[PDB]
Nucleic acid binder design. Sequence first.
RNA 1: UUCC
Length: 664
Amino acid sequence: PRRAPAFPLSDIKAQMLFANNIKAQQASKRSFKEGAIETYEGLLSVDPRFLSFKNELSRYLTDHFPANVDEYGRVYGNGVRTNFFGMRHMNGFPMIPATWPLASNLKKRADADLADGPVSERDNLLFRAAVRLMFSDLEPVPLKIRKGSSTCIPYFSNDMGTKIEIAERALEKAEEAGNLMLQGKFDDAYQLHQMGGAYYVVYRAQSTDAITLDPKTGKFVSKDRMVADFEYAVTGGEQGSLFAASKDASRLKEQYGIDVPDGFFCERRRTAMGGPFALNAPIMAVAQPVRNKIYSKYAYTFHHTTRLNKEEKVKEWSLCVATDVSDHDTFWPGWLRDLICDELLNMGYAPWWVKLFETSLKLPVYVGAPAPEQGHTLLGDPSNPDLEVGLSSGQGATDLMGTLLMSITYLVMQLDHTAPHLNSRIKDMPSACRFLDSYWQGHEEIRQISKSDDAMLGWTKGRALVGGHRLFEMLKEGKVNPSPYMKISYEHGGAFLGDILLYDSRREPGSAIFVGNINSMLNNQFSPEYGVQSGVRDRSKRKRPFPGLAWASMKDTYGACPIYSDVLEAIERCWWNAFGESYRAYREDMLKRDTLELSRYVASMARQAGLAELTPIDLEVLADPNKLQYKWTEADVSANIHEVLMHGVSVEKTERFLRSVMPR
RNA sequence: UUCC
Ligand SMILES: Nc1nc2c(ncn2[C@@H]2O[C@H](COP(=O)(O)OP(=O)(O)OP(=O)(O)O)[C@@H](O)[C@H]2O)c(=O)[nH]1
Ligand SMILES: Nc1nc2c(ncn2[C@@H]2O[C@H](COP(=O)(O)OP(=O)(O)OP(=O)(O)O)[C@@H](O)[C@H]2O)c(=O)[nH]1
Ligand SMILES: [Ca+2]
Ligand SMILES: [Ca+2]
Ligand SMILES: [Mn+2]
């Protein structure tokens, strides 16, 4: 309770956030904007033929293939875990009130009965152990930058050249600034090395949310989505309201003269931080090496590539629970940040860098335009970083923050309800590192596989096993939250990292298999999160460089699905039905075309040799480079293919930097 | 042209 400082774009504090160039300026002023997307080149998400197709196809599947999810959120049968009404959105038009970020989430947490720090000393050691194991013996790698991404505040450059400069410069003066912040001279810090200021709110829209058909009425329903209005966000819950955004698509007709079929809605719009690159870089410089560690040494619980690779691990469990956290980001504890920095200091990380890290995690945020007639407000004074927004997504290590948190959270959920007999193994700090280390390599009778908040908890034949079953039962009755840190619960129709866990009549981690989620396929093919940006000349700077290729890796990724074959026909039909064309064909050309274009961007790729030596991963990643942020890493992607989408800095330079940072 |  304090009420955070807000400033209008006019205020000098806001002005200082955007540089004296066009891109910057325009970003500061950009107003609300919506509109159809080019789902595929030449086709609009709103084309009648298409909406019609979407309407027919979505009903037919929902009708003919109802989910096969048991009383325990385990999917069996057809692998369908929910209706296919996902696609019924006007991709391009967001739900309208689109939320404001909270200046502070303490009340939010408290009011949800979640701790304001480790509750037991054990946990305190476990969290710190996670910090220890994770930032331990890190090994330097080039700092790689996504091509065509915006440096955001204060420049907003798109230019790989300019970025590499900003970055190299950053790693250079990174220490200077920061020692500057230790002195509390946050402004000097930003003015001289543009490290600070604020995050720039960016609205990644999730093209498909819950939509249902009330048999009773005959009309559809959109899962209400709660959004906090300004007053709410500034007071952190104290005043203001928190209502549902308006997903009604009818407006589209009166506004833009677009025929909106019944049961079609505006999409859900998640918000996300555009991090000040000057700052975000010195962080990524360390983040990636950490990534490399946990993904290697602790690959059992952290590195998951294929649906068979996962299957392997879960096959040996005697119990497998698919957990679920909702609104992970806004709940993320401020104290885990401070805990972490503290441990990092103890471990011996240069202060200034830790100080950069900290600041990075309590920075103000500039809200663009959440709705028509809104925004252009900067929350939190940048001269004195003190926000508690939870976990600012743009941040260089947002994925590591989410795991360091939930991994320990989950293990603690297991220690708490199924393996008391294990506590004695966690006496001092070391014992903890030792134990956590074992747990992470998948060597205890309790096991885990995760990514930030997505995970699967397992128990092997042993003592805990009986406890496990109790926990699972608790999550089903779900009248009680099993954790003191986050609100956890069982995932109805459990799946991990995009593949669905398909049990059979036996219902055991043993005879169960993993299969790509079919709905995911449908959503990806007919409900892209971004359009094809045919405007953008350089395809490697687009959100979907090579849309067409995804067709190749399709049979592969979604092959294992039970009703696969069927779906492909339902489509073929419904498509041919509303277009006269054959979908199979469409994608086949698209594939052929894109395959050619690709060879232009890939060197070794003989300027016509086939997709020959490209791995499926390589494909889905070229059709969607965003997946390189979560589901895959530099290592699971073909060498040269990675160069297409990324560009790094001289190792000689990042290495020199990494050295000055880490514990001597 | 708006993030990891
Ligand atoms: N930088 C970034 N991270 C993202 C983005 N989307 C999801 N994430 C990552 O995903 C996590 C959020 O978990 P999700 O399951 O996607 O969503 P959520 O906000 O937790 O809650 P629900 O969507 O309601 O289940 C965070 O830890 C973020 O780091 C995005 O657009 N940008
Ligand atoms: N850093 C980051 N993490 C993400 C992003 N999207 C998802 N994640 C993380 O990865 C997990 C699985 O993400 P999902 O969106 O459920 O799965 P998916 O592989 O994209 O498959 P679909 O269901 O088809 O969208 C999440 O729990 C998040 O923590 C993203 O843009 N950035
Ligand atoms: Ca979640
Ligand atoms: Ca996703
Ligand atoms: Mn899951």
